[PDB]
Amino acid sequence: PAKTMEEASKRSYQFWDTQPVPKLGEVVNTHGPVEPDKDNIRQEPYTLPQGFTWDALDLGDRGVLKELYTLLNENYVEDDDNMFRFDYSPEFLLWALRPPGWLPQWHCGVRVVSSRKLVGFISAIPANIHIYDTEKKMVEINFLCVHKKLRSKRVAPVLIREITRRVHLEGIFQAVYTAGVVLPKPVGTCRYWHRSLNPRKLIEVKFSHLSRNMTMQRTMKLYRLPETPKTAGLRPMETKDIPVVHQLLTRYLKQFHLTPVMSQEEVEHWFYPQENIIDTFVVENANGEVTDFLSFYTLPSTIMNHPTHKSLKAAYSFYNVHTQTPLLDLMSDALVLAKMKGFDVFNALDLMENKTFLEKLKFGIGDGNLQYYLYNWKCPSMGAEKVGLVLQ
Amino acid sequence: KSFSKPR
Ligand SMILES: CCCCCCCCCCCCCC(=O)SCCNC(=O)CCNC(=O)[C@H](O)C(C)(C)COP(=O)(O)OP(=O)(O)OC[C@H]1O[C@@H](n2cnc3c(N)ncnc32)[C@H](O)[C@@H]1OP(=O)(O)O
């Protein structure tokens, strides 16, 4: 895997060269499908290596959900230095994998035939995507995971082909997805930034480090936050707010070039607060009108090989819409709220208008890129500030 | 999806 854009051009993509995506060296000045929709689709599942079988995971079965939780907890994405691993919770996985329109065959597992052990996964969920001047029904691909003992055995290309086949069967021919690695061909490159909330714990676990000309006492004072948010009328989102949150979001996202197009049911699903999964706060002004909202989702990570600190509680910026409160004030209150809720760090990407507040609110740039990709869609690349899509 | 540390 290549993490850098120039080091990826020294690479050969035996699998991705067979796929309908632009070549990494290609420069795109067209808008449309790489290849036409297929009007006949392979009916049989692709072949897995001997001893492994497909299994669609019913995540409404608590035991199966727990098997997925364990597969990801032990084998999903780690940082560069193998010190931290994502720790998606079971109830978070239910939120991310059963939005409106979810399909059981799109929760695509791989099991050992003998032991029944879950050793592979990939998922699709449906999403209407606005890309420049086109609105397309697509899927979002997420949670591609291969057990560590199954790695480097061409199992991931099979998972990609098999979910592609199952999506094609439902009449969808484009997808969107993100990754930390460079593949053919990013439609946009974003960067994670981090805002320390408990700088002490973060330095002790070597998530962060003390700056050269700074001390620990200075570091704690630098990152100190108000006890309570300052925006008048800020409160948790309630059911009565679902229409206005939908309206605010739809209007706000028109300015970007890669965005979701959410129904009101999708807005309920993605924003209605659920403890330890998703937080949404609206601004209800002195007239009783909701004029802004902030949101962030809960995604802890496992701290590997540490005798005392086992987990890092992280908040991830989701969608933040401002029409009367300045964005800078909204995000300051998000940090205060995340601090109040026990989070250790607040992460945000440099997409949408986030660059207007990252430096001012004392975020530090991260070392990991997040590349955005479209499958079977040719369009010009865009800068981070035009990406208006956040995936879990 | 991509695990980032402060650079
Ligand atoms: C119309 C509908 C379309 C739907 C499909 C749209 C496309 C969806 C695409 C998937 C969206 C995923 C979005 C997310 O969930 S991003 C999260 C990915 N998951 C992880 O990083 C978890 C930890 N790692 C693992 O579990 C394994 O290392 C994985 C599974 C990542 C690779 O397993 P393994 O280490 O055993 O690799 P291999 O030997 O089997 O195969 C190597 C081939 O696969 C290419 N590869 C490696 N990593 C990725 C990657 N992250 N996306 C796409 N391709 C990847 C690799 O460059 C090579 O291709 P090429 O270099 O030869 O070309």
CB contact under 8 A, A367 and B5: yes
Structure tokens at A211: 């700056």
On chain B, the residues whose CB falls within 8 A of the CB of A302 are none
Rounded to the nearest 5 degrees, what angle is found at the Cα of A107, between the Cα atoms of A103 and A113? 135
Q: What's the gap in Å between A56 CA and the centre of ligand 1?
A: 19
CB contact under 8 A, A370 and B6: no
**Residue A15 near ligand 1, beta carbon < 6 Å:** yes
Compute the distance between CA of residue A193 and CA of residue A358 in angstroms, rounded to an integer.
7
Count of A-B CB contacts under 8 Å: 58
User: Which residue is associated with the tokens 């995506």?
Assistant: A21
Compute the distance between CA of residue A201 and CA of residue A214 in angstroms, rounded to an integer.
17
Compute the distance between CA of residue A87 and CA of residue A93 in angstroms, rounded to an integer.
10
Compute the distance between CA of residue A370 and CA of residue A373 in angstroms, rounded to an integer.
10
**Residue A21 near ligand 1, beta carbon < 6 Å:** no
Contact A299, A316 (CB under 8 A): yes
Structure tokens at A239: 């059911």
Structure resolution in Å? Answer: 1.7
Which residue of chain A comes nearest to B5, CA vs CA? A366
Contact A352, A389 (CB under 8 A): no
- Alpha-carbon distances of A303 from A94, A300, A312, A315, A341, rounded to whole Å: 23, 10, 7, 16, 20
Residues with Cβ within 8 Å of A33's Cβ and at least 6 positions away in sequence, in order, are A20, A173, A174, A376, A377, A378
- Coil, helix or strand at residue A213: coil
User: Which residue is associated with the tokens 């760090």?
Assistant: A345
A343 labelled binding-site residue: no
A146 labelled binding-site residue: yes
Residues with Cβ within 8 Å of A93's Cβ and at least 6 positions away in sequence, in order, are A59, A65, A68, A69, A72, A143
Compute the distance between CA of residue A372 and CA of residue A189 in angstroms, rounded to an integer.
6
Compute the distance between CA of residue A144 and CA of residue A166 in angstroms, rounded to an integer.
15
CB contact under 8 A, A180 and B3: yes
For this PDB entry, the determination method is X-ray
Phi, psi of A363 (to 5 degrees): -70, 145
CB contact under 8 A, B1 and A180: yes
On chain A, the residues whose CB falls within 8 A of the CB of B1 are 77, 142, 178-180, 370, 391-392
Compute the distance between CA of residue A10 and CA of residue A56 in angstroms, rounded to an integer.
37
